[PDB]
């Protein structure tokens, strides 16, 4: 297993360019490329990637072609340029994985036993996390269920290398928000958090509706981890919690009041100084 | 020229000592002949 997959900005920019390059003329679904990177104790660092010519057929969901020799000699070239980059997975721009992806993941496993495929939804721009890292697992499913391939999910995040960091910061240079935050951006962060929580709850509710209506089978497991979500509610309005909450709210409110008083006194002093200055100028004019 | 390496008398290599800068393993330019550059004498080297 893999604890994490940190994706550099270079690979997402490269997959964006690859999808734009292919779909500009070849209107097609997911475009497949290979993701290189460096390992760690357990966390993968995806650093560079390339595109492999791939074709697919919507019929039989198995008529596809991802080149073998192309992958091999792109890696030859990349290793010659930089030998630290190892094949660590592959990517496709399709928002959803296809029935076909199992074969491509096995083909990648032939090049890397712990191969992890990263879905990068280039077309949509949304709440966040445009990368989803998935790993193939194989087990008897413990609790006596028929076995299948399945793609276990591994968490992903977007990190950056110093050169990539300065590159991207200079690349934006027009919408980058202040890192200090300030009240407006903290409030917008809070609103964004509320929106994200609402979206996640809506997705979970849709999944639960699908399960209840029978359109999806009851997982019988992990669903009770969602039940664990339901149990973890803090249960506010408890007397001790209410008293502590009021105590800390007043502790913050007194500091807010002191700062507001400080600011008001400073503003009054500034206004007195300005009135004195303008009267001094008016009387000195004569 | 501190020493003549003489790997195979075809790619001989030459260890030189740049006063106090460093010491290096270089080859002669095509202008001069290997027999004209004996061990121990002082020679001019390009800066690159």
């Amino acid at each position: 297993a893999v604890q994490k997959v940190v994706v550099h900005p270079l690979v997402l920019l490269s997959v964006v360019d690859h999808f734009n390059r292919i779909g500009k003329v070849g209107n097609q679904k997911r475009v497949v490329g290979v993701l290189l990177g460096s390992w760690q104790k357990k966390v993968l660092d995806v650093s560079n990637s390339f595109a492999v010519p791939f074709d697919e057929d919507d019929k039989d969901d198995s008529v596809w072609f991802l080149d073998h020799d192309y992958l091999e000699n792109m890696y030859g070239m990349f290793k010659k340029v930089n030998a630290r980059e190892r094949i660590v997975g592959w990517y496709h721009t399709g928002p959803k994985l296809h029935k076909n992806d199992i074969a491509i993941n096995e083909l990648m496993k032939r090049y890397c036993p712990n191969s992890v495929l990263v879905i990068i939804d280039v077309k949509p721009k949304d709440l966040g996390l445009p990368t989803e890292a998935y790993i193939s697992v194989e087990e008897v499913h413990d609790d006596g269920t028929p076995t299948s391939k399945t793609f276990e999910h591994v968490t992903s995040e977007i990190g950056a290398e110093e050169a990539e960091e300065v590159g991207v910061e200079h690349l934006l240079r027009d919408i980058k928000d202040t890192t200090v935050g300030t009240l407006s951006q903290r409030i917008t962060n809070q609103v964004h958090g509320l929106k994200g929580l609402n979206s996640k709850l809506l997705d979970i509710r849709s999944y639960l509706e699908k399960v209840a209506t029978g359109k999806l089978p009851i997982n019988h497991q992990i669903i009770y981890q969602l039940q664990d979500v339901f149990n973890l509610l803090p249960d506010v309005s408890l007397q001790e919690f209410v008293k502590a909450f009021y105590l800390k709210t007043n502790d913050q409110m007194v500091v807010v009041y002191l700062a507001s008083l400080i600011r008001s006194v400073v503003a009054l002093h500034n206004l007195i100084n300005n009135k004195i200055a303008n009267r001094d100028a008016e009387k000195k004019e004569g | 020229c501190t020493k003549i390496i003489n790997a195979d008398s075809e790619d001989p290599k030459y260890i030189i000592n740049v006063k106090q800068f460093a010491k290096f393993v270089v080859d002669l330019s095509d202008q001069v002949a290997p027999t004209d550059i004996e061990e121990g004498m002082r020679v001019g080297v390009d800066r690159n």
């Binding site: 407006s184 409030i187 917008t188 609402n198 709850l201 509710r205 639960l208 149990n231 249960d235 | -």
Partner: protein
Amino acid sequence: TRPANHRQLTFEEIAKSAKITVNEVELLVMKALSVGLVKGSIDEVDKRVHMTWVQPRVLDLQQIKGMKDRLEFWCTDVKSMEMLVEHQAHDILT
């Protein structure tokens, strides 16, 4: 079966349900907590066992329907507060 707000359990209900003496419920909940299926606490002056859960279970169609209704209520509350926050903080938002 507790309504998740009054999670505290009285002694008499345990004694009458498991048909065991009121001096054995204490040791029974102790054993359950020790095994790793309960993460609550035990009181004695009121003898109300505080309850918290880390041991989930299997669901059912009716239970799933009810709990997704609860989740719908939760998401409706979240949406209502988000709407209130964006409406009140429109100018500061930027």
